[PDB]
Design a protein around this ligand. Sequence first.
Ligand code: CLA
Ligand code: CLA
Ligand code: CLA
Ligand code: CLA
Ligand code: CLA
Ligand SMILES: CC1=C(/C=C/C(C)=C/C=C/C(C)=C\C=C\C=C(C)\C=C\C=C(C)\C=C\C2=C(C)CCCC2(C)C)C(C)(C)CCC1
Ligand code: SF4
Lengths: 74, 45, 61, 75, 31, 75, 141, 136, 80
Amino acid sequence: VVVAFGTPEKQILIEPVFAQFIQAAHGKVLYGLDTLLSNPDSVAYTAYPNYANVWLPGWLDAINSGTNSLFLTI
Amino acid sequence: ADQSSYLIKFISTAPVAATIWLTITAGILIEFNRFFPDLLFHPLP
Amino acid sequence: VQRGSKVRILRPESYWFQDVGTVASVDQSGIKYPVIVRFDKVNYAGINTNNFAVDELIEVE
Amino acid sequence: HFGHLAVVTIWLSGMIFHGAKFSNYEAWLSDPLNVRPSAQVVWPIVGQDILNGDVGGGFHGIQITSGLFQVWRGW
Amino acid sequence: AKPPYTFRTGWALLLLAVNFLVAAYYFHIIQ
Amino acid sequence: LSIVIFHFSWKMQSDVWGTVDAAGNVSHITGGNFAQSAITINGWLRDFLWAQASQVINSYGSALSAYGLMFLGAH
Amino acid sequence: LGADLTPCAENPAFQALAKNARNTTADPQSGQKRFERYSQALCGPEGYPHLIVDGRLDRAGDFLIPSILFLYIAGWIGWVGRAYLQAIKKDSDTEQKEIQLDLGIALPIIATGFAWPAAAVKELLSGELTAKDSEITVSPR
Amino acid sequence: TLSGKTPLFAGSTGGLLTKAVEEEKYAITWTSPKAQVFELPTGGAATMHEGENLLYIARKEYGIALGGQLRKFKITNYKIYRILPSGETTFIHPADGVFPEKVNAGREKVRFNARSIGENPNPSQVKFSGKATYDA
Amino acid sequence: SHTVKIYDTCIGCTQCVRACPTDVLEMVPWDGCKAAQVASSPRTEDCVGCKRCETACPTDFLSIRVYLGAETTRSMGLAY
Ligand code: CLA
Ligand code: CLA
Ligand code: CLA
Ligand code: CLA
Ligand code: CLA
Ligand SMILES: CC1=C(/C=C/C(C)=C/C=C/C(C)=C\C=C\C=C(C)\C=C\C=C(C)\C=C\C2=C(C)CCCC2(C)C)C(C)(C)CCC1
Ligand code: SF4
């Protein structure tokens, strides 16, 4: 109704902040939350006692390129 | 007036009380949106 | 089970299972379902009476 | 039947009253080919005064399609 | 039985605490 | 009756209604497409329901926006 | 927060939409005052205000204030309807009083409905809010 | 076999088909105090005779609908027969001589269960046994 | 044919016998109710399965039940 009446700014537009948090918890820098794998100082990023998260550079390379369907922006 | 008691029992029936009450509610909402339009959110100080 | 005593149904198939009814009359002929019970709620057929046994009732006081 | 004829007559006299008060009928008589027939001005409340479109004759409202204008010109 | 309901509310408080933990990571209280 | 009024709409727009030039030739609204398109169900779906409903779906933000709203709410 | 949200004052698309602003009501400045109200919200890249409902007090007016207001009004309505149904079951013509309201019973109930949270807490702690599972009907299993 | 006069109607296409000659056929007989018009179960109007009447029909339900109609004409002596293609005529309604709404002695309980219906066993208790839950 | 069975909560009000369009049901002597009569279904081969008897029954859930079974010319109600 509000877009029909020429006023699309009156829409109720709700960000999906929880699933965006989960994407930011996976290293997606686009939202700017600076949490678990998007925070380089985090214990989940470094894997502090062992440093054995070998998967993580290729994973962040895949999730932070916007050219695939790996955690699409919502 | 005994007919006035009949009219009061008529107004108190479900469709008539419904149309009066929902007309009052819709009128309150319509008048509030006339005087204060476009309230997407409550504005904060 | 006395006439005019509020009872509760223990027949599971009934419309008024675990619901309060009122005893209308009790037959002394030795029949299996003697107690005539009346209800304020009607069932899906539009009927508010049924015959019950004494075992299918508990008194509500 | 009498009550129903009363309903239909209220409807008919209401359409004629909207043509009287809320229409561009006199502007339509002066130029029938370039003025679109319109009664029913819409109140402005929630942005719905977009529906009061430029129908011509210096008038804004909903363009009607029942042909009351042609009936009245033929009257 | 169990008027304090101590077993089912232990797991409910545990799930609610895991929920507050994820929310504490959400609002950047714990980083 | 839905097929009756669809026949009327597309036949009158395709073969009758339209503009007349000073030379006298008639250019119709949908351009005479009834003869070859209305003989298939695909032609109805495409050149009548898809093509002529462009005006009710592209009508948000215009004075015809209530008809787009009624189109969706009727669906 | 997420997916390119800026404040509406800093966004060029919001200020582009603010110039061509339709008037919602009869006064000529409704379209300007609309964007002047919405300027404090966050803004998507297309220019529209996006609400944030996660629960922070920076954006409490987006969802938290309508939440408390709705829950108060809806609890009023449901509480008053419950109290009226419980009021008329003692009158032995209860079905007639549902299609034909008693105003003399209903109007004090709708007047006393401002204290529905206090009354609901007092009925929950007393145990009169619910019925027992053996006292209400169920189907054969 | 059956004595009676066919009621007066000019024929319908709603009458009895090839099932009558190949499978089974029904007849209804009644007597009337006077000649009057009734409605056929096949559709249409027909005049019954003053005296004995006979009207062959395709289904038994036609005869019981007609016998329910004949009660409005205060006629309660109607009989329904079942006729096979061999010519075997059997008397089915009312079979006992008394209508089934009245209790007559000599009738036995058929398919009576001496329990309430909520006391039937579960389907899984009777599984692979060849019996129904409502049996006995 | 269909199976029509009568349970012991019968009160003998004879309404199922009156409702039946194909004469399946009859009333027999009994002693378990005040009216001293149950319904009985000897002609279940005439039963079409229309359940007017279950519509007519006044007891809370059905002293009489029709269980739809195999189909014949009579139970399907064919005039052909
Ligand atoms: C809760 C269940 C649900 C809902 C919400 C929907 C929603 C929808 N279905 Mg649907 N559907 C469902 C279940 C559901 N489906 C199921 C289970 C099936 C079976 C598989 C289908 C089968 C199905 C089919 C076959 C179709 C839909 C269609 C639609 C759409 C038409 C509505 C529309 O565009 O918005 C409505 C938009 C509006 C703008 C309406 C506003 C109208 C006015 C202006 C406002 C009204 C408010 C006012 C107070 C009312 C007037 C009161 C008046 C009397 C005074 C919509 C997306 C249809 C469609 O459009 O397909 C393309 C369609 O034809 N669905
Ligand atoms: C029964 C209702 C219900 C259901 C099934 C869902 C289901 C879903 N929501 Mg959700 N949501 C709901 C209500 C519900 N929501 C409400 C009331 C809000 C507030 C506006 C939200 C806000 C919300 C956001 C912001 C997001 C989701 C998302 C999602 C999806 C992922 C799971 C998730 O994040 O859950 C979230 C669910 C909750 C936080 C609430 C659970 C429902 C509660 C327990 C019911 C009672 C709520 C109560 C009325 C709130 C009163 C408010 C007051 C106290 C202030 C999933 C489809 C995410 C998404 O888009 O995924 C792609 C996402 O980011 N939801
Ligand atoms: C949530 C948003 C919202 C809101 C608040 C409104 C609100 C309103 N709209 Mg609206 N509208 C909306 C969305 C909304 N609309 C949408 C989404 C669209 C696009 C589809 C429109 C399109 C629209 C139009 C096109 C019009 C309105 C109109 C109206 C106004 C009056 C309603 C009316 O005509 O009553 C009608 C009331 C009557 C006709 C009178 C009531 C009947 C009386 C009670 C008598 C009937 C019974 C009686 C017994 C009969 C007598 C018989 C005899 C025997 C006794 C009202 C302010 C109208 C307007 O602006 O008015 C000028 C109008 O013309 N709206
Ligand atoms: C909702 C507001 C509203 C109202 C009051 C009207 C009123 C009218 N319009 Mg209009 N119109 C509207 C919206 C509205 N329109 C919209 C959105 C559009 C699209 C832009 C149009 C497009 C339009 C055109 C193109 C034309 C009209 C015409 C008319 C007139 C014809 C009378 C009529 O409605 O038929 C009478 C209708 C009925 C008898 C059936 C309606 C059924 C009931 C009575 C309505 C619902 C009542 C109630 C709210 C429902 C709840 C009750 C229920 C639960 C029991 C009248 C002035 C015509 C005219 O001649 O103009 C003067 C005309 O040509 N209108
Ligand atoms: C007294 C009013 C009242 C109250 C307190 C409730 C309470 C409840 N209903 Mg509800 N209900 C009502 C009326 C009411 N109902 C009516 C009239 C209908 C028919 C439309 C329903 C249909 C309904 C369904 C289909 C469902 C519920 C459910 C529920 C439960 C969850 C809350 C909910 O879904 O609400 C939302 C209820 C609705 C949207 C229905 C319409 C509510 C109307 C608008 C309010 C009635 C106002 C009342 C008549 C005013 C009386 C005032 C008096 C002084 C005269 C809750 C126990 C749900 C449930 O079982 O959850 C466990 C569920 O699935 N109800
Ligand atoms: C904070 C927040 C949030 C969250 C929330 C949640 C998550 C919650 C939950 C909640 C829950 C999970 C709840 C539950 C509940 C349960 C129950 C149990 C209840 C019930 C109730 C009742 C019972 C009611 C009653 C009543 C009343 C009160 C009034 C009216 C009437 C009636 C009766 C209805 C969100 C994120 C959204 C948003 C932001 C903020
Ligand atoms: S199903 Fe029909 S034919 Fe069979 S006993 Fe019931 S009413 Fe009679």
